Amino acid sequence: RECISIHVGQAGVQIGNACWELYCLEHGIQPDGQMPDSFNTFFSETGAGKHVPRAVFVDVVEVRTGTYRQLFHPEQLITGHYTIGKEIVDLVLDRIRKLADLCTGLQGFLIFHSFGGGTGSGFASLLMERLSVDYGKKSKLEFAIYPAPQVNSILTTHTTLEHSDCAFMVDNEAIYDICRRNLDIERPTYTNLNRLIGQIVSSITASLRFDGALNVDLTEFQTNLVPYPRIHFPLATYAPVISAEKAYHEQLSVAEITNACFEPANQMVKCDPRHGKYMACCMLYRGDVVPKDVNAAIATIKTKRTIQFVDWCPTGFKVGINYQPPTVVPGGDLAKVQRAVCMLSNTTAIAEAWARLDHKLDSEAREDLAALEKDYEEVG
Amino acid sequence: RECISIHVGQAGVQIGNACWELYCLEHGIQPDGQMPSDKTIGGGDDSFNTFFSETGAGKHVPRAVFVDLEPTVVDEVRTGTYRQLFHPEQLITGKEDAANNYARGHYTIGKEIVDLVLDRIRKLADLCTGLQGFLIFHSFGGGTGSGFASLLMERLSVDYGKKSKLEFAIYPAPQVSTAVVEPYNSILTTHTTLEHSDCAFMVDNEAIYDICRRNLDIERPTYTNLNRLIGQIVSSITASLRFDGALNVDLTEFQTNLVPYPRIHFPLATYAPVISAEKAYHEQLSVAEITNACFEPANQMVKCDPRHGKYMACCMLYRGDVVPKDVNAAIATIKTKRTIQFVDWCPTGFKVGINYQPPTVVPGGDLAKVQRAVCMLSNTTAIAEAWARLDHKLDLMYAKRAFVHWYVGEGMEEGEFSEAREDLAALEKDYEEVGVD
Amino acid sequence: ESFDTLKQFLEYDRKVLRFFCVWDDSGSVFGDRRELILHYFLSDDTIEIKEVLPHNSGRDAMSLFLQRRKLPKYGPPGVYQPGQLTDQTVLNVYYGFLLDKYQQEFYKDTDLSIGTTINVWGRKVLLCDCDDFTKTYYRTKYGIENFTSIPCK
Amino acid sequence: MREIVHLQAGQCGNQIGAKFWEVISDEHGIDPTGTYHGDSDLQLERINVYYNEATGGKYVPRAVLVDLEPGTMDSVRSGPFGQIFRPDNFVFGQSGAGNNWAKGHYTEGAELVDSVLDVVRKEAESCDCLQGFQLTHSLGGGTGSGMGTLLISKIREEYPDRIMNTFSVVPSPKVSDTVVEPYNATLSVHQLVENTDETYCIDNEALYDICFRTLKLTTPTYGDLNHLVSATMSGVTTCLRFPGQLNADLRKLAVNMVPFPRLHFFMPGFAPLTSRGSQQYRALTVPELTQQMFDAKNMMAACDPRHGRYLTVAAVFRGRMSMKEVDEQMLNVQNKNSSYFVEWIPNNVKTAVCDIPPRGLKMSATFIGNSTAIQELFKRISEQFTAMFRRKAFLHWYTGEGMDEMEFTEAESNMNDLVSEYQQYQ
Amino acid sequence: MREIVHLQAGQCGNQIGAKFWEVISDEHGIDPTGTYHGDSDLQLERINVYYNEATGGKYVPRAVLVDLEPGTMDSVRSGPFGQIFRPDNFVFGQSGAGNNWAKGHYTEGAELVDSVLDVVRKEAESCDCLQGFQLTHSLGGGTGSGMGTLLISKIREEYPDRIMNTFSVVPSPKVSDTVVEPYNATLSVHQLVENTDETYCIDNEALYDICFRTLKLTTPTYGDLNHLVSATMSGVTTCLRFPGQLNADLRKLAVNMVPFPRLHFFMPGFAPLTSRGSQQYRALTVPELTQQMFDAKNMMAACDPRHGRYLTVAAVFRGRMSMKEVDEQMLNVQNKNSSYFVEWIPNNVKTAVCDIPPRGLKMSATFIGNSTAIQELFKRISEQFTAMFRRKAFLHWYTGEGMDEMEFTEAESNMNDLVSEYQQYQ
Amino acid sequence: NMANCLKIFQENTRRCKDQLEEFHCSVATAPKLKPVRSEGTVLRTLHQYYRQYHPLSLECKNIKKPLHEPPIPGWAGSTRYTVMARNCY
């Protein structure tokens, strides 16, 4: 078992900082690399003892000479669509083939980027079709980041949409307003705005990380939550977030820790799916989650007509369980909780945000996005 | 079983401040908010389940709402002694007052926080498993205690509906007054809650000053002295849900025993042992004497004489050591006094509930430590003349149309005052419609 | 006779002597080793015992085991005739009474000590621990020291 | 061989049963744990009419405890004899009834009646030869009148042949404990008379005046009230459990009181009641027991029997006794009270003798009487229904569950027909 | 001499094996190091049915556990009984199953199912007279329905007449766990129904509800969900290993149960299901087992036979017991509730009495039964498959795995005819 | 068969009554405790018990919140409000 992580741009290196902080702090990885079987799926086994990370950083690249100079392999960390990619993409493919040759079996391929970056979107829209001609039908993941409304966007939709199995929608302002009503991080920074999405990228690979009772791997939600091979752009919310004191006052049980995902006040993007339709869902659990109380919680939601399911999804649900509670970062803002719920869902309610993008922008990307709008209206 | 109470206005949250200490003292829940590890109370294991929530770490968090739009009193409540016991999100804080206006708190400054308050109450209710009903703690003569409470009451029936809504209301005094515009925002907040309330209890200001003057011996008292007594009676009204006894009364039994009609649902409230420690042990507080004390007019918490009205329903909620013989022996001679007049359609006229828990006292507080307690819920037709005076003031002042320009400039319509006046005319008419023999 | 109750109620209102108890049972076919929490009330010499359920919810939850009256020491008595349990006899009436003059055992605090087994209506329960308030009360009232915990469960 | 299924509805019925199952526990020598601690072998010989034998020598009472709210289940279970009832015989809802009829009869009783039938018919399936159904409930409650009377309706549609006796608690004449007692009482009388073979009605006024007049208690707690009635129920089922000279089961009384199917309203009693201070200064013989049975000041149930006329009298004596004194004193109580008996029946008094008195007594007996002085019991309830239905007092919260006023007038008319049917014997 | 080769499919099969071979290990009295510790010697006699014997006093179970992901295998070896399983019998995949039964045999599973043919017919030839195979998988997952269904299908060529078996985990009714259950469960019934003849029916919520109300655990886990299916998993094959006075194998339970090869779907249960706090109140007799077997609260399947009709019933008993009372209660249940039973068959139920109870018990029974009420299951899954297939929603995977639209209509038609077959006996 | 059941039950009842009589004798035997330190001095150290471990009983002083402590969520006038308000004070 061996997973990989690719991150593109300044946004990519900044989110990889906190994501690999989470990964290195669940295990006993201190910033030198050594120890004082859960580590092999993101780190190698070097005979000297320094665990080489299984990560590629393409592009602030502070991270070179900061707290973790010796943990990151400097050859793996490399220093935007038709000019700069001629000497980097074919060169970082050499390092991808170098890391893949030592793994027994690769299963994960995780690419992170930003839509608004020249390099960030260009290398995002170069690496996956270079991926197609060297690796093929292997699974690839995309958890994209693009800023929310009211605060190159279409140049990459005509080349990445058809060649991407999954694509989330992470909006920075949509997390900016999601904590001030729940937490009290007044004036939230940016170097730790990626801490929450670091928690979500920890939760998505939980079964690959830890053992489980009813656990499910990385290849499955790109084969379960996708109805159609050209359209699958879901969303992801991590609603159960609080500080230590509200973790002390109110009692956290499984039933009322999942209702916060279904409510719009903790919905991770701004577009509430009351207009939209719940296509299907995905329970990624962790901690002291029992199989009983969860199945005593979805049944209450299912008999409610305030939510609206699509007609063709009678089941529309998916369950994965993980043993361990999430690991809390010193110097972070999470509470040492015993249970948490990770959400994956695709809705028709993304289409009105993209119609907002349509009339804000208002040539092939234009007509392709208009046809995508029409297709998304006809599907749901 | 569960119970959720709602405090609206600075009157409501000050009632919670000087009443929830008795909820923390019935059980041993600390002002810090935990069970002390070496000293114990001995009240079973689930007597705290109804009023406080249990967390696996061990700390106890209450089930209530303190909502106020003006910060100067709710901020004191949180910054005070119980700074950790209360849930922070359960204490809703605003940014501006109502200035004795019903209109602002009902439309303009109301709607942007009522959604968050509805979110808090919905989350708190879905936490509960056996929720029994609601209790309302709000004033009439204020602006934010009238308008926001009225909007919350009109929004409650849309969501849950059939769950019971009990009212504990503060009424303007007949002789003295605090503000000047209190009839307006009084009848404006009894117009919309009438179709939503179930049994609206009544509390006066000067009528409890008399109690704290002549039975209890305090000259020049303040609001906290009466607030502790209000806390005592509201805890005694929920006594049997939490502790065990011979005859048990829950929140679904007061409605079935007090109000016969949806249009006459305004009983009166009285607490009998109102003596202090200097005279508690100088006379014997027998059950006969404390039963005779509740029917004396001088013990009433609303400034009205019940001898001019006809009694309709009563609800004894006893406490501590009570012999069931002397209860019947006292009620049997209650019917013997012809000076207490009764109506013909209620031949029984009494509901009795017994608890085996003594009335606790705040240690070094005001009241004494006794063994017996009476909770009188006297439903009578003597509340009509407490409303005729407010109607008289409204008729005297509305003819010149004073201060209406304050209300009409924030979403009001001038024709709605006439509708509220006619609704109260019906609420006045149906009281003599049942006075026929 | 001292038939007043306000003495033990005023000066002993909120004092509860806790004792941790264990009821071993391997003689019966389906008895479990159920431990109990004891509460002696100095307010009216009454005594209630409480149950603590273990992990995985072996049994049902009632939160009460015995109620708020006095524990008999000499086992379960056969129930008396009606009127025999009165505290004071009375001559023939007159609604008033004229009392008599020319006319039952219960567990008290002097019998509960760390190391003894008591009779909760026939059961073989064993006092094992106490809290610090009970240690202070016994240290002052009866000079008992070394409240050593009995190792059970 | 003939086993009895006990029904326990409400808060009233729960306490009454919770202590009846302890006056029947010391008789059969059952400890709080559940093992036979008896003194002789007579109780061991036929301990099946109330108790079921479990696999480990434990004995399990065979009764169904039902109430809507669980605030009364925590009182019966925590008692001295509370740990011998089954976990499954505590059936419960989530809410309460609260002095109402419709909440336990139509809109919420119908949900949980299907949950109590599943344990009632299971309980009868383990029975060898069932005799009938005893029920403990309150007429002025919400669960006894609401749910228990539904169970009176429901069980006999499946077993029509078996006997039915109810220990009912009528509203008190002078002081009552709930403002809407007459509504529930009038609604329950009509379904009672159409469905029960016999009725044992108890009033708390007639218990309280006994604890004042005869027992001479100063502070009579409620257990002192419930002991008289528990002794009454234990003393009407004497002959099924113990051998005797002349033994009578429940069918042998039900063939002996009722001549007509709608004249089945009774008047219980109990003979050996002495004060604490007067226990050893009173001779305990048959004449001084029969001088306590047939008096009004020392009488259970309710109204004054001198204002009416008896139709029949039952008497279940316990203990080694001389039948000649029995017959002589019954003949003299018929002869001296000739003005207070019907002239159209030759012999009205039934005699049944078991051999075993209870603990602490040498002889005991239980009075059961059908009389037309029970007409006065329902006269005041009908007066209250007429005096409160004219103003339509609480009418809208019975219509708040879909019920109409036609059944209210039907119940009043049936009560009037019943109270006029008793009248023609004066 | 009658050896059972055990094949488990998927993480479901591995983790139901991890508790079935705990129940077998407790009933045959072996320890987590494989050797013998138990009290008696008759358990050691017929160990050869399940445990392969190796030199050095070791009893390897004849269990082959297959999966496409090695982490659940490492979790299996991480259990308390992870030692007694041989390491060679674990078949491990490389890529996942994708919540589909395609790639578990087509692309990656070709060489892997070639590899299990070196453990299926290797372990078979070590025996003498192989009684049969059996399987347990899930219909809501990919690898259990991929490898397990084709290993059901592939094993029919080499050993046709030997009895095969499967325990089908049908999808949950209310709270579904995977959206592919309309595909991955329905696609294993159209052609993988003629290969099997002893298909049971175990449902996830059908253990949840009974663990809530019967066993009364506030926090149930999968550790008793596996126990409740394993007790039936071994109680079906009790007379094979344990002598008795009426011996009857699983082939017996096949012959005496189904009239036709298509009608072979069952609906099991297990009778001693008492709460831990209700052990001391229940008389463990013969009638109280057959009482609980004929109830919906002790049914390990989603459907309800009150909506349907009993076709045939089976009962396999344990313990030295007398067979007058089982036949007495058996004649009682055929007669009183005669509406829920099917005509055109004289006697419908098979008994099998052995001598040895499970440890800590004295008497128990195992339930096997087909009905027409299991039509409620397949129609409820077929309506959800037909409510989504008409929009052509999920076909993009299935176009790329060599399956075209003919076998979809074949699956719908086989569902239709198996449903219409089950309607005549209503 | 019947004789064996009856003899087992007789032995069982006899043993259980024997243990109950032994328990009753043991309760009759066990010693009682007599008071050292009088009634008028145990209440004094109980009074001192309630004034140095649990001062909140018999006080109701309602002391103010100290100034080296951060406020509850917010009433006005990075990191979380606890740490930020600790830095502010």
Ligand SMILES: Nc1nc2c(ncn2[C@@H]2O[C@H](COP(=O)(O)OP(=O)(O)OP(=O)(O)O)[C@@H](O)[C@H]2O)c(=O)[nH]1
């Ligand atoms: N959520 C989140 N968003 C980020 C993070 N880091 C950067 N972003 C966003 O992604 C964008 C990244 O910057 P770029 O668009 O690549 O601009 P640039 O660094 O100048 O790159 P070029 O324009 O190509 O030279 C920023 O504008 C941010 O809005 C992060 O850590 N978390």
Ligand SMILES: Nc1nc2c(ncn2[C@@H]2O[C@H](COP(=O)(O)OP(=O)(O)OP(=O)(O)O)[C@@H](O)[C@H]2O)c(=O)[nH]1
């Ligand atoms: N009896 C009693 N009345 C109180 C108490 N506290 C406040 N009140 C009532 O409050 C009234 C004063 O008006 P407020 O309630 O302060 O007005 P408000 O709710 O703040 O509304 P706005 O001033 O518009 O914001 C007085 O007439 C009192 O009757 C209390 O503790 N006891």
Ligand SMILES: Nc1nc2c(ncn2[C@@H]2O[C@H](COP(=O)(O)OP(=O)(O)O)[C@@H](O)[C@H]2O)c(=O)[nH]1
């Ligand atoms: N005889 C008797 N009467 C009781 C008992 N408990 C309550 N009552 C009477 O029943 C009436 C109240 O019944 P109620 O509380 O409504 O019963 P519920 O329907 O179960 O709630 C009062 O008048 C009491 O006098 C009891 O244990 N015995």
Ligand SMILES: Nc1nc2c(ncn2[C@@H]2O[C@H](COP(=O)(O)OP(=O)(O)O)[C@@H](O)[C@H]2O)c(=O)[nH]1
């Ligand atoms: N009834 C039952 N269901 C189980 C058990 N273990 C797992 N499951 C169910 O298996 C389903 C998913 O497992 P699955 O995807 O089939 O695992 P796979 O075989 O590796 O594909 C979930 O719905 C679980 O409820 C068990 O022991 N009993």
Ligand SMILES: [Mg+2]
């Ligand atoms: Mg960029």
Ligand SMILES: [Mg+2]
């Ligand atoms: Mg205010």
